[PDB]
């Protein structure tokens, strides 16, 4: 009947950026009006499509990628961006066609003692290809002597944790991102507006 956008944005728990979650949106009428009128998103950048002219464009499939990063990394969720999240966690293609939506979630994803449940990848041998997911936990060798699964001299764990506490600056507070990507094949369109 109607696309379950509620299960993505209003989810009780979000995933870490290194293991970002993708939900497939198909065979439903997609109401983007709610997202337009909603004045709670700190980011609503669309690429290849305009958000206004969206309730009249049908697509074969819609994909919603969701994760949590900090404020100064939201700028990396865009085509042609580099840093530590776009290189080791979540990379968008240059010819991206979709929207990036993000909002501040300090009241939910911050613990007073420290929220260490959200993680991000810190080391990797090469940058991620577009829409690639890496969840391996093998020790990253950054030195001459190799690492046999043990940390030490130039042997670090590939995953690191965010602090996520209410006393940080906005640049370090947790932000929930939903990346809506649209694909259009030479096939009947199941998701309209």
């Amino acid at each position, epitope marked *: 009947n109607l696309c379950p956008f509620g299960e993505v944005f209003n989810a009780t728990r979000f*995933a870490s950026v290194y293991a970002w*979650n*993708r*939900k*497939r949106i*198909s*065979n439903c009428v997609a109401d983007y009006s709610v997202l337009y009128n909603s004045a709670s998103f700190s980011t609503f950048k669309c690429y290849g499509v305009s958000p206004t002219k969206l309730n009249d464009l049908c697509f074969t*499939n819609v*994909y919603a990628d969701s994760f949590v990063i900090r404020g100064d990394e939201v700028r990396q969720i865009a085509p042609g961006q580099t840093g530590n999240i776009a290189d080791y966690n979540y990379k968008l*293609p240059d010819d991206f066609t979709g929207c990036v939506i993000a909002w501040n979630s300090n009241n939910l994803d911050s613990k007073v003692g420290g929220n260490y449940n959200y993680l991000y990848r810190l080391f990797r041998k090469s940058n*991620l*290809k*577009p*829409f*690639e*997911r890496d*969840i391996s936990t093998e020790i990253y060798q950054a030195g001459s002597t190799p690492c046999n699964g043990v940390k030490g001299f130039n042997c670090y764990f590939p995953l690191q944790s965010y602090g996520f506490q209410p006393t940080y600056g906005v640049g370090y507070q947790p932000y929930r991102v939903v990346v809506l*990507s649209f*694909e259009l*094949l*030479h*096939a009947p369109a*199941t998701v309209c507006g």
Partner: antibody
Amino acid sequence: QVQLVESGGGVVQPGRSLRLSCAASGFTFSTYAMHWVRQAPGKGLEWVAVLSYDGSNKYYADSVKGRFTISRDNSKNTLYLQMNSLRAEDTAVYYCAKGGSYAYYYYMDVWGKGTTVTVSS
Amino acid sequence: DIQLTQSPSSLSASVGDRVTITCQASQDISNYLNWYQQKPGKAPKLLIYDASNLETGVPSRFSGGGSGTDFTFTITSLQPEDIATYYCQQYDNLPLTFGGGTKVDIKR
């Protein structure tokens, strides 16, 4: 109407080599990832290999590791599967499947009709 | 690898009965569980994607549920064209692994 047409499947002796092909149409083949799945007679499905959008990253199964080679030619819109040193287990119906957006190998949106490979002396 | 365990291996039910098979995962796979129907001779047809959603054309008689490790597949009302072997497949990680399968019989 995504079309996936397999070919090159036939009879081949144990130890010899065979090369399958998958002709994609109806979508930007250069952007999507590609899969290979086989199913032995009377057995269940088994994932074989997967390729990236530009054919730079490949991932196989241990059952075909070092023995099969997956490649693609984006100019010809074709997917390849070089099979060397074939045994009786490799006898199956081989399908190609379209993958995810780019390096999102976790999808199999469309499957082909499938070609059959029979390995016996 | 992530391993999948279907139960039962095969069952028999009358027409109109409620058929429910399970698919449990060796580790948390969120909701990346597919359900395939395969009649003998044909290729597998996808019925359920993302554990819960229905594929295009699949009748409303089919339904799916679950999250994490335990998943279910339910046919509320059995039909003559529902005699096949149903496989469940995870896609949380590579290699992509399938379930044992469940054959549905005509109860005689």
